[PDB]
Amino acid sequence: AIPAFHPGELNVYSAPGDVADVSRALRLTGRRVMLVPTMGALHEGHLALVRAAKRVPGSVVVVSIFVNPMQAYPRTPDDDLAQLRAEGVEIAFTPTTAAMYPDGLRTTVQPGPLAAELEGGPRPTHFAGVLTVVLKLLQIVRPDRVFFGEKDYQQLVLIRQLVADFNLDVAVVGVPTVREADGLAMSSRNRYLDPAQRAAAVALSAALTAAAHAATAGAQAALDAARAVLDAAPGVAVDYLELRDIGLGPMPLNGSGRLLVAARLGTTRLLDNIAIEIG
Amino acid sequence: IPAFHPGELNVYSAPGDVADVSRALRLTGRRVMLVPTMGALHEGHLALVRAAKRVPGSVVVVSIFVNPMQFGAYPRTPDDDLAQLRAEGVEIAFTPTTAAMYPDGLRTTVQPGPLAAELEGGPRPTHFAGVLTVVLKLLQIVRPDRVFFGEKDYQQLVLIRQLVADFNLDVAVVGVPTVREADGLAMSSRNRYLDPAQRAAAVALSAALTAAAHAATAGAQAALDAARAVLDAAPGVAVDYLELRDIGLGPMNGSGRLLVAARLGTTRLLDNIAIEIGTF
Numbered sequence A: 001a002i003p004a005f006h007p008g009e010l011n012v013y014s015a016p017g018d019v020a021d022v023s024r025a026l027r028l029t030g031r032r033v034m035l036v037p038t039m040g041a042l043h044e045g046h047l048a049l050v051r052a053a054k055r056v057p058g059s060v061v062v063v064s065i066f067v068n069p070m071q072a073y074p075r076t077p078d079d080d081l082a083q084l085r086a087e088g089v090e091i092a093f094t095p096t097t098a099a100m101y102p103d104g105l106r107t108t109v110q111p112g113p114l115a116a117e118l119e120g121g122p123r124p125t126h127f128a129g130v131l132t133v134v135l136k137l138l139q140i141v142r143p144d145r146v147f148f149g150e151k152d153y154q155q156l157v158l159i160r161q162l163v164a165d166f167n168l169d170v171a172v173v174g175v176p177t178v179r180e181a182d183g184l185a186m187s188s189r190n191r192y193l194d195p196a197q198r199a200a201a202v203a204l205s206a207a208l209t210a211a212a213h214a215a216t217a218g219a220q221a222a223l224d225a226a227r228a229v230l231d232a233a234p235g236v237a238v239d240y241l242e243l244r245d246i247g248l249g250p251m252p253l254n255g256s257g258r259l260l261v262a263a264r265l266g267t268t269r270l271l272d273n274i275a276i277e278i279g
Numbered sequence B: 001i002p003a004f005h006p007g008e009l010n011v012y013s014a015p016g017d018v019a020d021v022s023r024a025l026r027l028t029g030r031r032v033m034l035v036p037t038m039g040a041l042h043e044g045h046l047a048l049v050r051a052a053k054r055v056p057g058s059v060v061v062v063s064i065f066v067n068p069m070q071f072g073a074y075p076r077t078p079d080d081d082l083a084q085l086r087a088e089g090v091e092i093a094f095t096p097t098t099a100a101m102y103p104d105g106l107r108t109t110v111q112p113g114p115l116a117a118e119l120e121g122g123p124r125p126t127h128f129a130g131v132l133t134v135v136l137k138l139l140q141i142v143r144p145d146r147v148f149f150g151e152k153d154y155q156q157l158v159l160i161r162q163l164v165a166d167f168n169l170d171v172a173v174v175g176v177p178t179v180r181e182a183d184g185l186a187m188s189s190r191n192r193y194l195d196p197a198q199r200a201a202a203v204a205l206s207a208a209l210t211a212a213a214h215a216a217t218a219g220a221q222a223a224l225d226a227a228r229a230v231l232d233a234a235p236g237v238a239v240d241y242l243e244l245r246d247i248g249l250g251p252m253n254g255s256g257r258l259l260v261a262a263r264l265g266t267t268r269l270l271d272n273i274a275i276e277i278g279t280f
């Protein structure tokens, strides 16, 4: 017996078997299941993913909300669910840690070497946790499409690697980064920035968009333009600024690439990245 | 999509081909059964094939693939294999290339839990990572309703159960009892590597295990000592391990599994048996 599903309403399931049963039933009725994985505390950046999933004809949208142990964090369950309702999302999946990890951490996904780079420097087990939980959600929900923000570009690439390497039958959709009015990438960490820090923080996006336009003059011009912009900001400790190919390999001599930055403003770590076309 | 001819052996090499056919077949209400093998098929493999075939409305997919991951030498007889499959009424053989399975080498992989560091994994600490990685790929390509494994490779079976549980895979794992020669020797391809003396000495593994299983009314120590005594009486059998575990291969007077690995010349043989402590 499939759990109750009320079309056009927000249906909340916490039991993996329940969301799995409902998704399967819905797929059989000619719905295309879209999965939007989140950690709750939803803002406009997350809702852009929701909106992209909604515009697929015949879509039913499943938004998961779950905080992974292996990859201090504020939460607001009631408000997250109210945002989802307002967006017309029909399924929220909100499991417990014990439901997701009933045997603890036993089998896990080992990512390839990209997982040790960039964000994997300070947090070398982060992406193992990410790919493990994403794989699990992919198997529970069996979505036709899965949505990730370009904000976490390295995460997006690694999920593309997961999907290809494990022969997963799902399309990965990357969704452009939602920004504040001055270009700052939207993140829950932004609220922690004091006025001085919030003003200096614009340098990340400014550096990157400057680089993207300096790029007609080549790879070194792009890097130098970004570095100059970061160098003009006080209290911005750059962890890395790197230009890579779009799959995060070495930048080829020309063609398409990605410029990624990470920086600390006091105790708040910020990231950003942008498409670059070299030459 | 590619062609599927019902009631005949259909051989696909492209993962995309077998995935499309499997998906199509599952839409038609047929239940997809998967039997992973490395080929060189013998009656032990055919027990899993037959188990799969008896599932009402099943279409049987047998994969034949030798994984360069789980090694760290294997007999290949692919014409025979397909002939046997045809004889069993199997409708699908999946025979992918190494390039098709590993186009990016070893990139994303499965990291098994600590059980994989033990028993068979002690000497071969990356073996089960190879197994779980290839089986996960096969499960994703084929998407079967049920996947069949022999109790012959009991630790592998247990580890597949963990994989399926831990990744929330939508597949039933079916263990199939060990097929034995007339004297009790567990059927294995590695047996062929035994000369007539070694083959005669090889009966000791199953004799020791079955002796243990009957001794076990008298407790775990009696069961283990009986097995060891038989192994000790056996000419030119060198024991790697002989271990009594719980049925999920945790420790230990309940019910359990006794496992043995032994060498006869260069040939490493494995066997295991269900054990009940204090139960007639």
Ligand SMILES: CC(C)(C)[C@@H](N)C(=O)NS(=O)(=O)OC[C@H]1O[C@@H](n2cnc3c(N)ncnc32)[C@H](O)[C@@H]1O
Binding pocket: A037, A038, A039, A040, A044, A045, A046, A048, A049, A068, A071, A130, A133, A134, A147, A148, A149, A150, A151, A152, A155, A175, A176, A177, A178, A179, A185, A186, A187
């Ligand atoms: C995947 C999971 C395991 C659940 C976890 N590691 C995670 O990332 N949780 S999350 O709550 O922090 O992000 C949810 C999704 O929302 C995207 N996102 C966030 N800010 C965004 C923005 N400004 N513009 C565009 N997209 C944005 C992220 O890129 C991610 O794909």
Ligand SMILES: CC(C)(C)[C@@H](N)C(=O)NS(=O)(=O)OC[C@H]1O[C@@H](n2cnc3c(N)ncnc32)[C@H](O)[C@@H]1O
Binding pocket: B036, B037, B038, B039, B043, B044, B045, B047, B048, B067, B131, B134, B135, B148, B149, B150, B151, B152, B153, B156, B176, B177, B178, B179, B180, B186, B187, B188
């Ligand atoms: C899983 C894979 C990655 C393909 C690989 N590690 C593998 O095991 N290849 S294999 O060709 O050696 O065996 C295929 C299956 O056949 C079973 N089996 C063998 N002898 C058996 C016997 N005597 N009685 C019952 N069952 C028997 C094995 O237990 C296994 O489940």
